[PDB]
Design a protein around this ligand. Structure first.
Ligand SMILES: [Mg+2]
Ligand SMILES: [Zn+2]
Ligand SMILES: [Zn+2]
Length: 1269
DNA sequence: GAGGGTATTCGCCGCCTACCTCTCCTAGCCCGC
DNA sequence: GCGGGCTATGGCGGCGAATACCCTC
RNA sequence: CGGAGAGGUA
């Protein structure tokens, strides 16, 4: 269509190649197994590197040397025949090898299921035999002629049997004569009875051999007759001698072959329409396993029938050769060439082909020719796919060779190593250190990495400033680092953003744009507030740097990816540039009020006026800096620049506001005034100790009420204040600080008494081993709890350890107990607790045995961590693949469908208790209906963001359930609409019209995978994997299918649960329920003669998703899946808004399984898209309707991803060979429309700034401004 | 012995990302100089 | 006689398809 | 700079 390519691509088609196509591609033939000569270091002729086939090896030159200049352009050499052109042509031209005998393609023969077996209706073993010269196949038979001659041939063979039996009977008459002769021979004298019986033994044993000769020789003819008369095509006869007898006796009436040519002949004499009709008949009728087999047979046959693609492409007559420059051969140090894997396989094929050609041409016995044809078949099979059948062809050192198939498959294959990832210029890498003087939009770049990243700009500016007359001098001056290159560089790098990236890039914020400022050293200086977003630390971490060049890239960096614009987590909406650790400690210390502090406010004592009332924060600062006042002391100041609180302002100023400049009296500490002076001017006074939660709330309110620049400035000021006041807080560690509980020994002795009593009871046989272990474990768990409580009580409130823990800076009190009080129980390598337990804290010093038994759990955790980091990436990749085509396309579909959120179910006694999990179920949603309470007016109008004010008003009105718009019910044909999706968590406003929400959902779900521990019912990452894969859970618990009472029965290893419906139509029953599983408690535990709902889960465990869909429909399975995934993630304290899971689930319920084909062409049991199914049914019903029938189906993410309409997106995900071989048979065309496909073909992705409405915007100066010029 | 219904076993597919340093790629034997 | 080139029984889970064992006609 | 193996950092 477009030869090389050149853009304006419209479709990419794939299909089988016939011998004609393969011979048209080739520019020549390879018929000599010679690669390159050593003396002249030139390719040979008619080899794998010939310059007369693949192209010249030197630009505008000939192997002849006749023409070696551009003037001789386009002329084919008259001496050597090599065309004169550029050397790059060797990357394009291909050659072919003309096989002496037909060869089958291994993909369509060995790949399970065998696509030749279904096509020809032959078992895989029959193909294995016929193709590898071990059996004979009847390619043809003559029926009418042989039927006519059957009557005569019957009599002919009857006469021939007459000859056999009559010769036998005459020879037996001779045997009888010899028998009488022997009788007389031993009767002429006195012989022995054993002698007579011996002559009879010999003679009559050879007469029994006469009878057995009749038997065997005539059964030979009977077998010949039976085989010949009933023989039909596609019959395999072993014992070549039998076939030789058949052909010799009946040369005509049939034709038998052996090898790939036999299969080629069979395919040639094979009509497709008749077979398709026969299979359709067997499908419409018959039933049974025959119908199931006919379904697959018809799949393949209709695939080969619908298109103009003959099935004769499976048998090869020519073999294409890849261009040489894509399979080059290099030389090790010294000049010794090491062969590539492809070259060796090509050489083997060529050798075998030539030797077989010689053997056939010179004439030879059939055995030798057949053996050589088999050895050529094997070599050609190994070329395409080495190791599929038989032992892999191994090279030096016993390692299998890399075939042509290996180039396309695996993590090191073409796709996932070269098309989905690249090596890019204008990038570097170095270690990262903390720069506390930077700003959120700034980074520090060494003054030796910038000089290399920004080289061309520096050269341009040097030439412009007349520092270098030309480009070469500027280049060399840059390479020599003259003192002025730095002066020009500082100007060059100004206002040019830089992209920094840390691996692994779990989520979106792993790449952010900053502004470069040159620093001293060789490390990168990273602002402390982006570490959580990058998940970076300063113990040896490294990062990469990228530089966008073009104007669009710079605009994207400056607006989309700038760090100061990305403060909130896209997954949940919580801030990520919040202070942490040292900043939290400093602010927490600053905004504290310690009673009885220096300079504290004192009421009037009756002799002197009040002490501690100041007339301005300036005077308070003066007093503090004079040592008379403490920053953490309660004072009464007179504030005129801080806006008063809500209550104080309401009761003091009222009116409209405080109108900056007014004065009011505050009773607070100096530190809190200092802190509130950091917040925006209009923010009401905050008078509280700044726990991490309080700071988080302040930052979130700022984000949701103010512009983002205000938030950035506020966080920077808080950073400065915290880093200043952490140094003065006085937090250090010494063994004097690590206090020990005062009465640890008493508690340990008290519980050791109980342990001893349990041990003595065990000794007296009162309990077994497990009971003793359980009792000891409970005793020691209680002991550890008491020790921890005592330790918590003992510590003062200003201890550095307790201050750091309770400040929210980092850590938890379990570590404090381990350090000071006691470590307690430790786990065996199995996972069970050691009943000892460990009894010394790390302050005292564990003994040798305690340390050794601690090492077990110490190592098991690291091993599990490695396993989990391995497990999570696969799930993330699968999620990204399944839902990569979900993009916001419309502003509003104006539908009315919606879902209902629990939204604070009412209390029994009467009260509105808020549902704990409401932030991830109601916020950032738009109402699909109006909210009316107690016949009142609408509280919230349809189409409202439903934020904090809205939810608070709804709760105040007294309504528990509301209907909201969701992606599960969007009515857009392709993609979701903005209103159904709702608010964008990162931006805080309605999502844009080019938002790729599928990838955001995938990264949000997969990023907190390592945190989610991998801990017989699955309860972690395996549980998530089986939920998203829609597999049978494990502890599958039956679910009712019709409401009714149950006659519960009790038995060992089985429980009979019968569904007695209220209607009484029929009773379902399950008797295989093992006694190990419990009975679920619904409404009291499940009991005999108890009515149950339709979807109630009788037993305990996990329900299978495929049955709830059958019983309760799609909505119920959707809510079930969302609830299960949310439960799994909440168990580990991770918050993910339900819209991401809703996107993922929506991508899993998108098809319908077909039942009745009707006038429609859908085959029974196939998975068909719902939109296409409905469209086809509606089209058909117009004209004498015979609509097809379908049912909802649930698919896993892997199947849903491999059932794509693009054969290029599925081949880059998994199972490249199977996808390619099926697509080639179905002759699928790829309409390139998607993120992955456009990335692969190097075209703008259809999302974000690549949509038509954005990429095709027009700009011009205004008329007024144009005139003002 | 073929049919239809169960079990049973074997083969294939999958198993995170980025970066740094260091050592080695046949053996036999037959022909040629 | 030595060098160079040519040839010749420590993964594991899921899943499906190719095939053991038993009642029926 | 193509392959195989060994060790290591986040
Ligand atoms: Mg680190
Ligand atoms: Zn020439
Ligand atoms: Zn919609």
């Amino acid at each position: 269509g477009a030869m090389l390519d050149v853009n304006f691509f419209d479709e990419l088609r794939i299909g089988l190649a016939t011998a004609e196509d393969i011979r048209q591609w080739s520019y020549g033939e390879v018929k000599k197994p010679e690669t390159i000569n050593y003396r002249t270091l030139k390719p040979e002729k008619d080899g794998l590197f010939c310059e007369k086939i693949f192209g010249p090896t030197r630009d505008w030159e000939c192997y002849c040397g006749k023409y070696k200049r551009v003037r001789f352009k386009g002329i084919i050499c008259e001496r050597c025949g090599v065309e004169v052109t550029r050397a790059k042509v060797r990357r394009e031209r291909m050659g072919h090898i003309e096989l002496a005998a037909p060869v089958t393609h291994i993909w369509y023969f060995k790949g399970v299921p065998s696509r030749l077996g279904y096509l020809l209706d032959l078992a895989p073993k029959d193909l294995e035999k016929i193709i590898y010269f071990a059996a004979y196949v009847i390619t043809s038979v003559d029926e009418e002629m042989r039927h006519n001659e059957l009557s005569t041939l019957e009599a002919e063979m009857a006469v021939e049997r007459k000859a056999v039996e009559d010769q036998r009977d005459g020879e037996l008459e001779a045997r009888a004569q010899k028998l009488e002769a022997d009788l007389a021979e031993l009767e002429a004298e006195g012989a022995k009875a054993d002698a007579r019986r011996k002559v009879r033994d010999g003679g009559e044993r050879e007469m029994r051999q006469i009878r057995d000769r009749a038997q065997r020789e005539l059964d030979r003819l009977e077998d010949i007759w039976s085989t010949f008369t009933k023989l039909a095509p596609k019959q395999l006869i072993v014992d070549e001698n039998l076939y030789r007898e058949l052909v010799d006796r009946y040369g005509e009436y049939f034709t038998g072959a052996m090898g790939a040519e036999s299969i080629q002949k069979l395919i040639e004499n094979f009509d497709i329409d008749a077979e398709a009709e026969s299979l359709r008949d067997v499908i419409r009728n018959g039933k049974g396993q025959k119908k199931l087999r006919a379904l697959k047979r018809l799949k393949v046959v209709a695939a080969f029938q619908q298109s103009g693609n003959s099935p004769m492409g499976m048998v090869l007559d020519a073999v294409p050769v890849i261009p040489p420059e894509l399979r080059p051969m290099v030389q090790l140090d010294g000049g010794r060439f090491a062969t590539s894997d492809l070259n060796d396989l090509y050489r083997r094929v060529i050798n075998r082909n030539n030797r077989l050609k010689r053997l056939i041409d010179l004439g030879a016995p059939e055995i030798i020719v057949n053996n050589e044809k088999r050895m050529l078949q094997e070599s050609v099979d190994a070329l395409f796919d080495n190791g599929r059948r038989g032992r892999p062809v191994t090279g030096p050192g016993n390692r299998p060779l890399k075939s042509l198939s290996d180039l396309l498959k695996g993590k090191q294959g073409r796709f996932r190593q070269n098309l989905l990832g690249k090596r890019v210029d204008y990038s570097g890498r170095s270690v990262i250190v903390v720069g506390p003087q930077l700003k959120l939009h700034q980074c520090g770049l060494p003054k030796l990495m910038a000089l290399e990243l920004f080289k061309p700009f520096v050269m341009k500016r040097l030439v412009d400033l007349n520092h270098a007359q030309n480009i070469k001098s500027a280049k060399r001056m840059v390479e020599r680092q003259r003192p002025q290159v730095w002066d020009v560089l500082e100007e060059v790098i100004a206002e040019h953003p830089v992209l920094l990236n840390r691996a692994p890039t779990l989520h979106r914020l792993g790449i952010q744009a900053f502004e470069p400022m040159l620093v001293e050293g060789k490390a990168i200086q990273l602002h402390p507030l982006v570490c959580e977003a990058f998940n970076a630390d300063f113990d040896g971490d490294q990062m990469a740097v990228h530089l966008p060049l073009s104007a669009e890239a710079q605009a994207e960096a400056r607006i989309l990816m700038l760090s100061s614009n990305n403060i909130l987590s896209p997954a949940s909406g919580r801030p990520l540039a919040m202070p942490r650790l040292d900043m939290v400690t400093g602010l927490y210390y600053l905004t504290t009020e310690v009673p009885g502090d220096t300079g504290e406010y004192q009421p009037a004592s009756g002799d002197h006026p009040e002490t501690g009332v100041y007339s301005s924060p300036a005077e308070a600062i003066m007093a503090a800096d004079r040592g008379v006042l403490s920053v953490r002391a309660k004072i009464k100041v007179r504030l005129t620049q801080l806006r008063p609180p809500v209550e104080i302002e309401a009761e003091l100023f009222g009116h409209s506001g405080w109108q900056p400049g007014d004065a009011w009296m505050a009773e607070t500490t100096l530190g809190r005034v200092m802190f509130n002076e950091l917040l925006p001017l209009g923010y009401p006074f905050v008078n509280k100790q700044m726990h991490k939660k309080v700071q988080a709330a302040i930052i979130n309110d700022l984000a949701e009420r103010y512009p983002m620049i205000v938030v950035a400035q506020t966080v920077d000021k808080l950073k400065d204040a915290g880093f200043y006041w952490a140094t003065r807080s006085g937090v250090t560690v010494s063994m004097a600080d690590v206090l020990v509980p005062p009465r640890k020994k008493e508690i340990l002795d008290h519980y050791e008494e109980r342990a001893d009593k349990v041990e003595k009871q065990f000794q007296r046989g009162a309990l077994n081993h497990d009971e003793r272990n359980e009792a000891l474990v409970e005793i020691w768990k209680e002991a550890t709890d008491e020790v921890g409580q005592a330790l918590r009580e003992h510590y003062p409130d200003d201890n550095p350890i307790i201050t750091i823990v309770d400040s929210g800076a980092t850590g938890n009190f379990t570590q404090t107990r381990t350090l000071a009080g006691m470590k307690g129980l430790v786990t065996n390598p199995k996972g069970e607790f050691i009943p000892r337990p460990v009894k010394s804290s790390f302050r005292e010093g564990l003994t040798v045995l305690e340390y050794f038994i601690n090492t077990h759990g110490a190592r098991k955790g690291l091993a599990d961590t490695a396993l989990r980091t391995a497990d999570s990436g696969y799930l993330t990749r699968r999620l990204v693949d399944v839902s990569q085509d979900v993009i916001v396309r419309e502003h509003d579909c104006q539908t009315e469908r919606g879902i209902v959120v629990e939204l604070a179910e009412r209390a029994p006694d009467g009260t509105l208790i808020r549902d704990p999990y409401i932030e991830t179920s109601a916020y950032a949603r738009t109402l699909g209906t109006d909210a009316v309470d107690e016949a009142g007016n609408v509280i919230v109008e349809r189409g409202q963001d439903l934020g904090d004010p809205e939810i608070d008003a709804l709760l105040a009105a007294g309504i528990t359930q509301v209907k909201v718009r969701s992606v599960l019910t969007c009515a857009t044909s392709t993609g979701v609409c903005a209103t159904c999706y709702g608010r964008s968590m990162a931006t805080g406003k309605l999502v844009d019209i080019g938002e790729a929400v599928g990838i955001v959902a995938a990264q949000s779900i997969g990023e907190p995978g390592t945190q989610l521990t991998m801990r017989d019912i699955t309860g972690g990452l395996p549980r998530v994997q089986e939920l998203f894969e829609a597999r049978v859970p494990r502890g599958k618990a039956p679910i009712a299918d019709v409401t009714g009472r149950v006659r519960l029965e009790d038995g060992e290893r089985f429980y009979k649960i019968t569904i007695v419906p209220d209607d009484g139509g029929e009773e379902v029953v399950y008797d295989k329920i093992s006694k190990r599983q419990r009975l679920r408690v619904f409404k009291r535990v499940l009991s005999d003669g108890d009515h149950v709902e339709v979807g109630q889960q009788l037993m305990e465990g996990s329900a299978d998703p495929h049955e709830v869909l059958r019983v309760q429909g799609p909505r119920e399975v959707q809510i079930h899946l969302v609830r299960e995934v949310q439960e799994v993630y909440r168990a580990q304290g991770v918050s993910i808004h339900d819209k991401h899971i809703e996107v993922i689930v929506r991508q899993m319920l998108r098809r319908v399984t077909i039942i009745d084909s009707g006038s429609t062409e859908f085959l029974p049991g196939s998975l068909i898209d719902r939109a296409e199914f409905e469209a086809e049914n509606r089209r058909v019903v117009a004209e004498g309707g015979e609509p097809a029938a379908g049912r909802p189906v649930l698919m896993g993410i892997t199947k849903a991803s491999l059932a794509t309409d693009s054969w290029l997106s599925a081949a880059s995900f998994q199972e490249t060979t199977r996808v390619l071989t099926d697509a080639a048979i179905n002759c699928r065309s790829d309409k390139l429309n998607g993120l992955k496909e456009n990335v692969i073909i190097g075209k703008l992705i259809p999302a974000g700034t690549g949509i038509n409405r954005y990429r095709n915007i027009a700009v011009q100066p205004t008329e007024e401004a144009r005139a003002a010029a």
